[PDB]
Amino acid sequence: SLEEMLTQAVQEADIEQVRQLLERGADANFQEEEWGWSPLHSAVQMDSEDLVALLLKHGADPCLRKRNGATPFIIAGITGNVRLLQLLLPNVEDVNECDVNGFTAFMEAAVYGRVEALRFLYENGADVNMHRKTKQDQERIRKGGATALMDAAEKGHVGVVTILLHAMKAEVDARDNMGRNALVYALLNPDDGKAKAITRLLLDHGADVNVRGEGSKTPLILAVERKNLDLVQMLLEQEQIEVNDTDREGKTALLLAVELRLEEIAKLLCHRGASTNCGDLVAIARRNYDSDLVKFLRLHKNWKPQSSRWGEALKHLHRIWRPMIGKLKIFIDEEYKIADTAEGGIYLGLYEDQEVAVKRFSEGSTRGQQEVSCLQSSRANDNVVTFYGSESDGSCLHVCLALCEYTLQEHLANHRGDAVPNEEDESARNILSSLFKAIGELHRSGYSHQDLQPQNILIDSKNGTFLADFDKSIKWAEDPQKIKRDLEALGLLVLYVVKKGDISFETLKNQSFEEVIQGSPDEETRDLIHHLFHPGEDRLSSLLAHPFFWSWESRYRTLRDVGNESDIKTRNQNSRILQLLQPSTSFAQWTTKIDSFVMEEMNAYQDTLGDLLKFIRNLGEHINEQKNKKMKSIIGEPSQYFQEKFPDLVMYVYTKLQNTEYMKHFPKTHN
Amino acid sequence: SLEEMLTQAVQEADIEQVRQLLERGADANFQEEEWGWSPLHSAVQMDSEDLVALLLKHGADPCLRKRNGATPFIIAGITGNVRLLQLLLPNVEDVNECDVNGFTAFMEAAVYGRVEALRFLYENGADVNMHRKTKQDQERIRKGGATALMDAAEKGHVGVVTILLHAMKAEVDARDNMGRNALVYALLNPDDGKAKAITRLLLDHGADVNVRGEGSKTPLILAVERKNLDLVQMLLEQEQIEVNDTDREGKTALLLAVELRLEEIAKLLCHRGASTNCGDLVAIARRNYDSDLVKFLRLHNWKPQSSRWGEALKHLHRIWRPMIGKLKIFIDEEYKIADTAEGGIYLGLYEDQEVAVKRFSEGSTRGQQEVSCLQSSRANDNVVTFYGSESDGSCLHVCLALCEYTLQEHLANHRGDAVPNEEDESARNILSSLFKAIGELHRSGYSHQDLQPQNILIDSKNGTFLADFDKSIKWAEDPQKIKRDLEALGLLVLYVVKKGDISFETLKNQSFEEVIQGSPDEETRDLIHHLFHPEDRLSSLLAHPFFWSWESRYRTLRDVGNESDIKTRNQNSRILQLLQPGTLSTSFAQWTTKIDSFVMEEMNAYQDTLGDLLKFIRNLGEHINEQKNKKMKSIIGEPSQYFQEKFPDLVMYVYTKLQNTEYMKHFPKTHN
Ligand SMILES: Nc1ncnc2c1ncn2[C@@H]1O[C@H](COP(=O)(O)OP(=O)(O)NP(=O)(O)O)[C@@H](O)[C@H]1O
Ligand SMILES: Nc1ncnc2c1ncn2[C@@H]1O[C@H](COP(=O)(O)OP(=O)(O)NP(=O)(O)O)[C@@H](O)[C@H]1O
Ligand SMILES: [Mg+2]
Ligand SMILES: [Mg+2]
Ligand SMILES: [Mg+2]
Ligand SMILES: [Mg+2]
């Protein structure tokens, strides 16, 4: 708290307290840790000569560099006070000392328009034509290399430019590391008057007119894009200029002029030799309702969409002309409409030339902010609809998403006739495990959905299932109890998908827990829905190991593997395994529910669960043998047989063995 | 080709050919399918009265609407020719007829600055204060509702604005559906002179100064952001103005003024009652090196997800930086992830998400290759997640999901996780992700060209992602280069299986033969073979036994050894014909001698055929854990590992014999 008192004293301009603290023995060369500012740096910055003299008196170091490598002398160029420069100069080894990005005191005087300081630094040996030397990482991307002239041109300091060219012998056509000259920088200055003056000065002294800036634009193109007739005239006076040069996108100055409704600029370019073959200029001028330009122009002369459902319209949208909204191409017409929304709608779009679905909100919409906020945090979530980005025009927030084919509701309806009635539903399993992963990672990211329902779940070309509608999402830290509403709706969605869309979601929403459970067609489904209604943060990832997600072959495999334990086969009643299994079921009296034929042959068995497992293992191993042709024909597919006959068996075994060493008999599962 | 000749004749202004074609019997009401343009619409648009009169003579319909619902009369407002308006008016039912977005002839005359047409339409009953009625989808996002005054203000037509307010009784404070008035529109006009004039006119007639535009900005804030002292003065003259109002981000006009180095504007706001408590204005003015403004002012929880990068990410979140679009970044060694060819990888925050930022020259061909490929790969789950890109004047910043480690670094960090001969599950997962990544990349029309361990990234969750696309190409150009990816993938298979012990450069200097010879097992050899000698080749190979777990391989052998024809040793069965058509240099020739002496005797209470080996594996499998067999169990150890180490070619041999037969059913469930 000695040098910290000094620092605040210098800021507040308290000179006597600075004297006292300096004589009490406080370090004048203290540099604060974050940005390396010293009291001297601060004194020069605040333009206070009394503190500068006082600090130097007590041995402040004028060679001291802050984090960006700037010294107090460099900073003095910024402030532009010649007296501070004079005072510091004797202690300065090199007047052209630079910071880590290449800035000298002279350059800073040019950037900040400090004329007196510029003159003083020139007279004391400043290199007027020094290029900024910078770090290796900057040089390798062609940054750095700018001069004082370029800076002064960019910032619109006409006086400085005049003086640099006339009194200080500045190189008019010097180039930075990207190949730009002062003329390019001059045309980036938004002030029209200063840009016009500086451009004339530069052109008069022989600035090269055929150079390139950003996007490989020429000075002529920059002048057209800025819609300035005078700058265009000025530039077209130079007879060496190349009027038909193209920017990186292949656009010529004429083409841009017609596109931007610049009639006079366009005529002037034609008269100075610009070619009509750069584009369909007539159609463009017509489109703009530039009647006179159309007459003048008349006188003087593969893409494939990925989406099947939306492909035809996507092709048409690619074909037509539209103005861009940042990276988005879109046209509000019924041909390109996907669906209604609360806020006017989902439309097809092209974003960075990728097909997308575009959800449109009012730019002030609270829900649009909820949607975009959640999507911005969910880009790593593979089971969430892929977010491309967003674009505002004046009024509408456009949220661009991966284009999907169908809603889960529509998808289930399209495929409702695929399966033979008691076929195993593999696709239900895949749909739901994606949703578990989606919702699980969404919660991990701190968000809750609030609206999980079949029309917010999207299926893509590859039959991938994605979670989609986040306009009502919330950060759950606010109200943790609302995470349970997601899990409940997920329970409903489990039944919805398992019933193949036959029972509407609204019907399911109007049922009690008990009724939902009673409406389930099997025990795996019942138990799973139970755990979602009574959870009750990796609950969802752990439930992927639940037997609802085990295939029928895997369930049958597990039963057989348990029925092969030596203690089951020897019927050792005091074994750990039979302990576990023997503690109101469909397999009570199981030997009577099996077919009469089958039971007799296998006997060449008691009503215990251990013996049922033993039975399943034995039948499993010997069912396909030639002697057992009749057995095989009666039972049919054995996994389906035992499950239909004993619906609670798989869940019962799972529950008894769940956290024992006999987990090893469960199938390999996701993790 | 009758009405198509007419259309071109009208465009070329060929009046006599139009007469002939009209009398040859061509429909004057033909509307081209795409945009619904008729010859009459086209005639009015090109400002040709002779064609307009001639077309109307032959029964052209002036009520005819094109795709956007505009009639020839509406278009006449755009062109602004009063004579065409006079000519069409008698046939027009309502002078205020509008298109689907609400535009009338009057409004169009205002938008396009057509003064004579504006006057004519006013005198013939135009509703000056009509709000644009538009479609339901537009209204529900609060678009539409603009007036002629707003349009004229927006487009900088001072004459029209003057005339609307003074001669035509325009409502100065009317509002569109978003709640904006003509004053907001006036301040969006980039021409300073016209903006200043129109603003004065509007303010003089009593435009409400406390309104909101985009981002909930006020007219005062718009004036500050546009850096115009005169517009600020003009607005601060109104004594009802609220100087301390905030935009959606909580910024006040003063705060913005200081941030943008607007000394005079800032002083003027302070004098007119703006409060200093809107932010730390002194620190901001200091930061900007606005010394005089500093003197004047003096007188008057976030958590990063990344463990490796978290500390530096916290620091970057804490400091002040200017934004490059959506990207916050600072080029300093503390935030540097790595060197590149061009500019390096630095930590960044993009839409407040932590990212790795790869920097290119804005003109870099490589940078265009990288961004092009990433733009097409957003659906590819096994490619590093692309957030977006941002250019400043010079540098293209490509923003990616921040990963922890390279595959090379990851393998080195975890080299001691596994016991001597443990099954390498993680190698399998790493490689199947890469197969899927590269497979979908090719499907998107792209080739990588540089697949190597330092271009593969592992994230916090141990997910593996493909990453460096500066040398990617569209392969349609040269399809043969797709093979270079598959070759490098073969190298990466060995690299990962050898756990990073053999460097990738070593592997790159070897021939196909040497790579194969350097593999530690038969599954790996066969897989690498199919990658060197190859469209989902790479999705089909996920079914290859390299990706089968040891339990699955053992399960398959047992399941084959349970076939009834194997157990009865029925030599003429289809199954035994597949596995052992008679004369072997396999490792399981004479297999009964290579098994332990003890084990063989007990199971005998067996021939040197493959069928009997399978039979043996099934029997041992079913009875190994029984109490009587305690010694057997202890000698064999884990049986899957036992048979595989004893008979290294057995799994591949069975796979190959049964590959496309009905006995595929014994293979494990696989990805698809
Ligand atoms: N990315 C997409 N790809 C294809 N269809 C989509 C996509 N996003 C949304 N949709 C469809 O458009 C509808 C838009 O609904 P949504 O995004 O849920 O907005 P919402 O305002 O919540 N709609 P509502 O369900 O009517 O309130 C969905 O039901 C889908 O049919
Ligand atoms: N998204 C990322 N997250 C974390 N580290 C990354 C990320 N992207 C790249 N890197 C790291 O930084 C290096 C950048 O290399 P890369 O993106 O391959 O550019 P490059 O020019 O090909 N590099 P070089 O291999 O030097 O040519 C990688 O090897 C990684 O170590
Ligand atoms: Mg919805
Ligand atoms: Mg919704
Ligand atoms: Mg690399
Ligand atoms: Mg590279």
List, in order of start, the domains of chain A with CATH numbers.
1-301 (1.25.40.20), 302-551 (1.10.510.10), 552-671 (1.20.1440.180)
Contacts of B139 in chain A (CB under 8 A): 344
Distance CA A413, CA A404 (A): 16
Distance CA A538, CA A444 (A): 9
Backbone angles phi, psi at A666, to 5 degrees: -75, 155
- Token pair listed for B436: 């899927």
Q: Which residues pair with B400 in a beta bridge?
A: B356, B386
Considering only CA atoms, which of B468, B507, B513 is closest in space to residue B489? B507
E strands along A352-444, which residues?
354-362, 387-392, 396-402, 406-407
DSSP class of residue A288 equals T
- Determine how many CB atoms are found less than 10 A away from the CB of residue A249: 10
- Ramachandran class of B130: left when φ > 0, alpha when ψ lies in -120 to 50, beta otherwise: beta
Length reported for chain A: 671
What long-range pairs does A2-11 form, CB within 8 A, spacing at least 24? Answer: A2/A26, A2/A27, A3/A27, A3/A30, A6/A30, A6/A39, A7/A32, A7/A39, A7/A42, A10/A39, A10/A42, A10/A43, A10/A46, A10/A51, A10/A55, A11/A42, A11/A46
Residues forming beta bridges with residue A359, ordered by sequence position: A346, A399
Taking the C-alpha atoms of residue A152 and residue B429, their distance in angstroms, rounded to an integer, is 58
Backbone angles phi, psi at B506, to 5 degrees: -60, -50
Distances in whole angstroms, Cα of residue B575 to Cα of each of A612, B446, B556, B559: 32, 44, 14, 12
Helix ranges, B155-280 (H): 158-166, 182-188, 192-204, 219-225, 229-236, 253-259, 263-271
Cα separation, B488 vs B479, whole angstroms = 16
Neighbour-count burial for A639-665, b at 16+ CB within 10 Å, e otherwise: bebbbeebbbbbbbbbebbeeeebeeb
Q: Is the CB of A385 under 6 A from ligand 1?
A: yes
Tell me if A439 sits within 8 A of A492, measured CB to CB: no
The angle at the Cα of B587, spanning B582 to B593, to the nearest 5 degrees, equals 90
**A556 and chain B: CB distance < 8 Å anywhere?**
no
Pick A389's closest partner by Cβ from B388, B459, B551: B388
Residues with CB under 6 A from ligand 2: B 337-341, 345, 356, 358, 384, 400-403, 406, 454-455, 457, 467-468, 470
When CB atoms are compared, the residue of A47, A354, A395 closest to B142 is: A395
| A562 close to A653: Cβ distance less than 8 angstroms | yes
CB A458 less than 6 A from any atom of ligand 1: yes
CB contact under 8 A, A344 and B626: no
Which helix (H) or strand (E) is B104 found in, with range?
none
Compare CB distances from B378 to A142, A388, A564 and report the shortest one's residue.
A388
Alpha-carbon gap, residue A243 to A263, rounded angstroms: 17
Report d(CA B38, CA B209) in Å as an integer. Answer: 45
Angle of helix B522-532 versus helix B482-497 axis, rounded to 10: 160
Is B665 touching A (CB cutoff 8 A)? no
**CA of A222 vs chain B CAs: smallest distance (Å):** 14
B112 contacts A138? CB cut-off 8 A: no
Nearest Cβ partner of B394 from A12, A143, A298? Answer: A143
At A396, phi and psi to the nearest 5?
Answer: -110, 135
Q: How was this structure determined?
A: X-ray
Q: What is the largest CA-CA distance in chain B?
A: 117
Distance of CA A389 to the CA centre of its chain: 6
Q: Count CA within 13 A, CB hemisphere, residue B591.
A: 25
Structure tokens at A276: 């009509």
DSSP-derived letter for residue B668 is P
DSSP B389: E
B577 backbone dihedrals φ, ψ, rounded to 5°: -70, -35
The whole-angstrom separation of Cα B224 and Cα B233 is 10
In DSSP terms, which residues pair with B359 in a beta bridge? B397
Q: Which strands, in side-by-side order, build the sheet including B464-466?
A: B405-406, B456-458, B464-466
Residues of chain A with C-beta less than 8 angstroms from the C-beta of B135:
332
Please give the Cα distance from B82 to B120 (Å, whole number): 7
- The answer to whether the bond into B325 is cis (omega within 30° of 0) is no
* Contact call for A344 and B140, based on CB within 8 A: yes
Return the structure tokens found at A120: 């003083």
Q: How far A417 CA sits from the closest chain B CA (Å)?
A: 22
- DSSP state string for B456-493: EEE-TT--EEE---TT-EETTS-GGGHHHHHHHHHHHH
Distances in whole angstroms, Cα of residue B17 to Cα of each of B41, B158, B312 = 18, 43, 76
Q: Which residues of A touch B622 (CB under 8 A)?
A: 564, 621
Looking at the CA of residue B455, tell me the nearest atom of ligand 2: 18
Contact state of B360 with A626 under an 8 Å Cβ cutoff: no
The neighbourhood of ligand 4, an ion, using CB within 5 A, equals A 469, 471
Structure's resolution in angstroms: 2.5
CA–CA separation, B587 and A365 (whole Å): 72
Q: How many CB pairs (< 8 A) connect A and B?
A: 151
Structure tokens at B167: 């001669």
For residue B178, give the nearest of B240, B131, B222 by alpha carbon: B131
For A347, nearest residue in chain B (alpha carbons):
B137
Ligand 5 centre to CA of A554 (Å) is 43
Give the CA dihedral B219, B220, B221, B222, nearest 10 degrees: 50
| Angle made by CA atoms A144, A147, A151, in degrees to the nearest 5 | 95
Say if the Cβ atoms of B551 and A178 lie within 8 Å.
no
Question: What is the CA(B663)–ligand 2 centre distance, in A?
Answer: 46
Query: CB within 8 A of B382, min separation 6: which ones?
Result: B433, B434, B436, B437, B440, B464, B465, B466
d(CA A485, CA A367): 19
Partner A contacted by B423 (CB < 8 A): no
The minimum CA-CA distance between A511 and chain B, rounded to whole Å, is 34
Sequence ranges of the binding site of A:
451, 456, 469, 471
Instruction: Identify whether the C-beta of residue A547 lies closer than 8 Å to the C-beta of residue A650.
Output: yes
User: Rounded CA gap, B50 and B53, in Å?
Assistant: 5
Residue set of the binding site of B: 450, 455, 468, 470
In chain B, the residue whose alpha carbon lies closest to the alpha carbon of A362 is: B141
- Radius of gyration over every alpha carbon of chain A, rounded to an integer in angstroms: 39
A339: CA distance to ligand 3 center in Å? Answer: 10
The verdict on A289 touching B (C-beta cutoff 8 Å) is yes
Among A360, A386, A668, beta carbon nearest to B379: A386
Residue closest to A189 by CA, chosen among A152, A225, A156: A156
In one-letter notation, the amino acid at residue B208 is: D
Cα–Cα distance for residue pair B595/B590, rounded to 1 Å: 10
Q: Do A46 and B294 touch (CB under 8 A)?
A: yes
Whether A375 is in the pocket of ligand 1, judged by its Cβ within 6 Å, is no
